Amino acid sequence: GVTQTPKFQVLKTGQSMTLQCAQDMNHEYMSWYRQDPGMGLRLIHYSVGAGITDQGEVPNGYNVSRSTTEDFPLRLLSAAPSQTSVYFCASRRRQGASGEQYFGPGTRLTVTEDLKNVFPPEVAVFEPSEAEISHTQKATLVCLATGFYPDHVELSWWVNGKEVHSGVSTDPQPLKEQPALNDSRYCLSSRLRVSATFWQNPRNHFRCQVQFYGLSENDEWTQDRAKPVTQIVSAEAWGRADCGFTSESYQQGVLSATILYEILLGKATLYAVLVSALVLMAMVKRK
Amino acid sequence: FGLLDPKLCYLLDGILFIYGVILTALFLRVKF
Amino acid sequence: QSFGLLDPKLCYLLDGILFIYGVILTALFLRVKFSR
Amino acid sequence: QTPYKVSISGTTVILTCPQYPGSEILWQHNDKNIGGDEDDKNIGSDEDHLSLKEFSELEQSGYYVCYPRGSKPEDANFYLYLRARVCENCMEMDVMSVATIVIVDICITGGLLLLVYYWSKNRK
Amino acid sequence: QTPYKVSISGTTVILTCPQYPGSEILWQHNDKNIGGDEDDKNIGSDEDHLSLKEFSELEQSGYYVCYPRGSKPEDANFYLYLRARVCENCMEMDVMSVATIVIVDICITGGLLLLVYYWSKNR
Amino acid sequence: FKIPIEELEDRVFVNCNTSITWVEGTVGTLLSDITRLDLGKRILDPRGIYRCNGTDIYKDKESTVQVHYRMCQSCVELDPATVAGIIVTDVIATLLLALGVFCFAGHE
Amino acid sequence: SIKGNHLVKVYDYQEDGSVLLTCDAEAKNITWFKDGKMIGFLTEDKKKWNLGSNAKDPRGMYQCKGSQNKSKPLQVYYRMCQNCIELNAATISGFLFAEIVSIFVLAVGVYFIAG
Amino acid sequence: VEQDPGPLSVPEGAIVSLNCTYSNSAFQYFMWYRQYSRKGPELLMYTYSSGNKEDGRFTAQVDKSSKYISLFIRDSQPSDSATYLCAMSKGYSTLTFGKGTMLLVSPDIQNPDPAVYQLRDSKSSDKSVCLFTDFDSQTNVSQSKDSDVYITDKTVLDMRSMDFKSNSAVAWSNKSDFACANAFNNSIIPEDTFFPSPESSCDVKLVEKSFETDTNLNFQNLSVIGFRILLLKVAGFNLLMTLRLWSS
């Protein structure tokens, strides 16, 4: 199909960025669309041949280059705060004979005026309450990833080391903490609803992975806190039945049983040794 | 039937071993 | 609900063994009480 | 080379990085520098020790690495994957510690039964 | 319908495909041919047996299928979904068998002690 | 034609595009919609042979899956040395009771 | 962290207590080393080397080899109790009660033998 | 060139009708893209003549005389809530995309039980959430009055196992005097809205439904049974030897 690289990208104002498209179905000509909330898809450049590049609707500040016939990379020589958009690659075979296109998976950019604004997501996993497990008999874990910037998370639920795609709702658009301001901070939530005879095991393990995409190692940082690189922040929880007879009280019950019965077995064997010694001494002293 | 089962098993072990010792004491106080 | 090889039937088998032994000795004690 | 010493006392884990003598030690947990003087005061650091107080199986498990002061942790030669439960006032059950408990109880009760035995023979 | 034979002994899973007469049989797992490379001692192929030695719950589970040589492999329509645990030196032991073991132990003790009773009565 | 045996949270759901015909084994629960058959939990070892038709594709072929689990939890790890230890200590205890009845009946 | 030759990762949390290891290299025949010696010879379809359950507390050095040199080690460690016993008032009271009733039964027995 | 924006809301299992106006030009082909949230626009239908065409459960119609094109959907699942874009151009190049239309298919829930549950904070951060759920699937959940109380919009989580589509919204805050009775005050609230008592319920027979068993517990229980057999046999030996030493 059509691939493009990177997925997410952060960069300071006034900084170049080369973002690559690739197409192995051997269609001829590609285009770069950008998308903003409120204006729809807008064309930037399109390259009808191996080298024949033409401008689109908004070519203002976009160097393209067409050298091969499977790659058409876009370049941003200088950056602007009005560059925050979602970019897309296109793919067409031959000049309106087959009018279909095939869009790539999306490429995001946010451009800050200063790199003291990036933060890692603070992730918390809120366990359900017994009101649900009595009333509806279903439990809803809620993950909150608060405080990150920019909107570059990919939240995912892992149950016993494997993901779940069944019972997970996630907000498509994050909020802002201050919606009136410009350099705000985002907050994303998620709900895992689970049948409440699965939460009551102390053996199941639920965790909320958040794949933050941010700075890289090749970028300077002179600020006191840790440098917020591309990372994974997650919080875990065992399942917990609070009141009842789970398989940990039973573990300690059987361990105390093994202690008491090894002790009692030692008692009875020593009393057997004592009475056998008394019987042997009495049989010596009768014969 | 499944409230806190091992404690019930072992307390029933307890007050039947005590009654076994009391039965042996009855044999020791009746037979001789 | 999955106990497997974990049931209270097994500890209650052993306690039933102690109960049957106690029943036998109490019955023979009461037959001694009948005997004199 | 030389393994990390994970000394667990009660609900307090003391990690010990045996290498790098004399130099100063920094600790990464899951690529996140801890051991410094942050607001978290349940975690202390020493010349070569890491003292984690009130260990939590979910939070404080995972990878660990000691590395010398001012070097790169990806050039360190040794990683640790700690996953440890802790338990307040919880004495474990070794193969031989329980046998020592049994033999101590055997000796105590044998002494008591010998005292009662010679007491009864003196009443005999 | 005649089911597949699954025989699980320790860490050895033996599968047997009954429905074909055979003499040329092939086994496929998760769209991959398995057995028949003259390597992989753990994976043995027989007349109609498949011997998965050191079976692994996480990596060997899924859809097994027998098919004769000549048949294309996506034409077969009887699939096994196998998932199994493989604790080594670890055997299946249900509760009623343990109850009979304890009662048979009691019967052997009572029988031997009554033998001692009668062979001391004879003195 | 793979009948999709999906494994949810701790259950097993046979999915099909049409109604699942039970043949033998665990009966299970037809869900609130048809074309989905719950088989209970996984640790309670659901086994059986199930058969369904195929619509939208496959030209109305009918196929059969055999669901077989061995979630080994009525199982016990045992060394041969530990089995020998249990048997030998049982034999020693029975011989102690034999000598006990012997020495008690000889000197009543 | 697959550069810097830290090629061994652990995939621990699982349905049972099975600890698994993974190595990132040219996957034809991964050769798994514990402590210096050799323990494993892995081909496709296998990817993950096992260590058994985490009740047995699998510890020690681990490393892998692909077609390149050996990886850096990994000290896998576990204190996953499955024997730890909390000292409640109930367990201590039960231990002391069983001890007292045992020594009283044995005391009456010894006192009636050597009476 | 002119597509009607704004999220339209259709109940589950209902024919949805969308249309794009393009008056006027002479366009060859007409085609419909579907874009989910945070993905790329995926193609659905591609026609070239004036009239009707059907693929799957979708229907693309072209009206060159009426000068608008239309998309019809039957059996509208809740899993088709997406932004629909329409595209046409001339014979050569330069596709023209509309602004796209948000389609929200709220479900039919068939057994509503609206309630506001306090959830239990997990000792890491200072927040505390009040999950409000099941809604009658027609409850407009507005935003908040404060700047410390947050509200998410209603989302439809889709349990595949129990087969139970549910609605949810989560309100978290960093402040005192944030109780769940005073949390969703801004939005309209239906009846019977089960605000729970702070005293717990504690169904014990429902905790027993979740009890697994490892191999370690099986073998330790069998070791306990073996020690009970050995206690019975050695105590039988002890009582026989005491009756022997008291009989003589």
UniProtKB/Swiss-Prot annotation, chain C:
Places the protein is found: Cell membrane
Post-translational modification: Phosphorylated on Tyr residues after T-cell receptor triggering by LCK in association with CD4/CD8.
Intervals, Extracellular compartment: 1-9
Disease field: Immunodeficiency 25: An immunological deficiency characterized by T-cells impaired immune response to alloantigens, tetanus toxoid and mitogens.
Family in the record: Belongs to the CD3Z/FCER1G family.
Function: Part of the TCR-CD3 complex present on T-lymphocyte cell surface that plays an essential role in adaptive immune response. When antigen presenting cells (APCs) activate T-cell receptor (TCR), TCR-mediated signals are transmitted across the cell membrane by the CD3 chains CD3D, CD3E, CD3G and CD3Z. All CD3 chains contain immunoreceptor tyrosine-based activation motifs (ITAMs) in their cytoplasmic domain. Upon TCR engagement, these motifs become phosphorylated by Src family protein tyrosine kinases LCK and FYN, resulting in the activation of downstream signaling pathways.
Name of the protein in its database record: T-cell surface glycoprotein CD3 zeta chain
Organism: Homo sapiens
Primary gene name: CD247
Residues of the full protein shown: 22 to 57 of 164
Curated annotation (Swiss-Prot), chain D:
One GO MF term: T cell receptor binding
Membrane topology category: Single-pass type I membrane protein
Cellular location(s): Cell membrane
Keywords of this entry: Adaptive immunity, Cell membrane, Disulfide bond, Immunity, Immunoglobulin domain, Membrane, Phosphoprotein, Receptor, Signal, Transmembrane, Transmembrane helix
Residues in Ig-like domain copies: 1-80
Any single biological process term in GO: signal complex assembly
Highest taxon, organism lineage: Eukaryota
Membrane-spanning segments: 95-120
UniProt entry tagged with the keyword Membrane: yes
Intrachain S-S bonds: 17-66
GO cellular component terms, semicolon-separated: alpha-beta T cell receptor complex; cell body; cell-cell junction; dendritic spine; endoplasmic reticulum; external side of plasma membrane; gamma-delta T cell receptor complex; Golgi apparatus
Post-translational changes noted in the entry: Phosphorylated on Tyr residues after T-cell receptor triggering by LCK in association with CD4/CD8.
Stretches in topological domain Extracellular: 1-94
Function: Part of the TCR-CD3 complex present on T-lymphocyte cell surface that plays an essential role in adaptive immune response. When antigen presenting cells (APCs) activate T-cell receptor (TCR), TCR-mediated signals are transmitted across the cell membrane by the CD3 chains CD3D, CD3E, CD3G and CD3Z. All CD3 chains contain immunoreceptor tyrosine-based activation motifs (ITAMs) in their cytoplasmic domain. Upon TCR engagement, these motifs become phosphorylated by Src family protein tyrosine kinases LCK and FYN, resulting in the activation of downstream signaling pathways.
Protein name in the entry: T-cell surface glycoprotein CD3 epsilon chain
Organism: Homo sapiens
Shown stretch of the complete protein: 33 to 156 of 207
Curated annotation (Swiss-Prot), chain G:
Residues exposed to the Extracellular side: 1-93
PTM (free text): Phosphorylated on Tyr residues after T-cell receptor triggering by LCK in association with CD4/CD8. Phosphorylated also by PKC; leading to the TCR complex down-regulation.
GO molecular function, one term: identical protein binding
Bilayer topology: Single-pass type I membrane protein
Keyword Transmembrane helix part of the UniProt annotation: yes
GO biological processes: adaptive immune response; alpha-beta T cell activation; cell surface receptor signaling pathway; establishment or maintenance of cell polarity; gamma-delta T cell activation; positive thymic T cell selection; protein transport; protein-containing complex assembly
Function: Part of the TCR-CD3 complex present on T-lymphocyte cell surface that plays an essential role in adaptive immune response. When antigen presenting cells (APCs) activate T-cell receptor (TCR), TCR-mediated signals are transmitted across the cell membrane by the CD3 chains CD3D, CD3E, CD3G and CD3Z. All CD3 chains contain immunoreceptor tyrosine-based activation motifs (ITAMs) in their cytoplasmic domain. Upon TCR engagement, these motifs become phosphorylated by Src family protein tyrosine kinases LCK and FYN, resulting in the activation of downstream signaling pathways.
Protein name: T-cell surface glycoprotein CD3 gamma chain
Native organism: Homo sapiens (Human)
Primary gene name: CD3G
Entire protein: shown range: 24 to 138 of 182
Swiss-Prot record, chain H:
Gene Ontology cellular-component annotations: alpha-beta T cell receptor complex; plasma membrane
UniProt KW Transferase keyword: no
A Gene Ontology BP annotation from the UniProt entry: alpha-beta T cell activation
Protein location: Cell membrane
Effect of residue 238 to L/F: Impairs TR-CD3 complex assembly
Annotated S-S bridges: 130-180
Domain of life: Eukaryota
Keywords: Adaptive immunity, Cell membrane, Disulfide bond, Glycoprotein, Immunity, Membrane, Receptor, T cell receptor, Transmembrane, Transmembrane helix
Region (Connecting peptide) residue spans: 202-223
Residues covered by the Ig-like C1-type domain: 127-215
Spans through the membrane: 224-246
UniProt-annotated glycosylation sites, renumbered to this chain: 140, 174, 185, 221
SUPFAM superfamilies: Immunoglobulin
InterPro entries assigned to the protein according to its UniProt record, in alphabetical order: Ig-like_dom_sf, Ig-like_fold, TCR_alpha_C
Residue numbers on the Cytoplasmic membrane side: 247-248
CDD domains in UniProt: IgC_TCR_alpha
Free-text comment about domains: The connecting peptide (CP) domain contributes to the TR-CD3 assembly and signal transduction. The TM domain mediates the interaction with the CD3 subunits.
Subunit relationships: Alpha-beta TR is a heterodimer composed of an alpha and beta chain; disulfide-linked. The alpha-beta TR is associated with the transmembrane signaling CD3 coreceptor proteins to form the TR-CD3 (TcR or TCR). The assembly of alpha-beta TR heterodimers with CD3 occurs in the endoplasmic reticulum where a single alpha-beta TR heterodimer associates with one CD3D-CD3E heterodimer, one CD3G-CD3E heterodimer and one CD247 homodimer forming a stable octameric structure. CD3D-CD3E and CD3G-CD3E heterodimers preferentially associate with TR alpha and TR beta chains, respectively.
Name this polypeptide is given: T cell receptor alpha chain constant
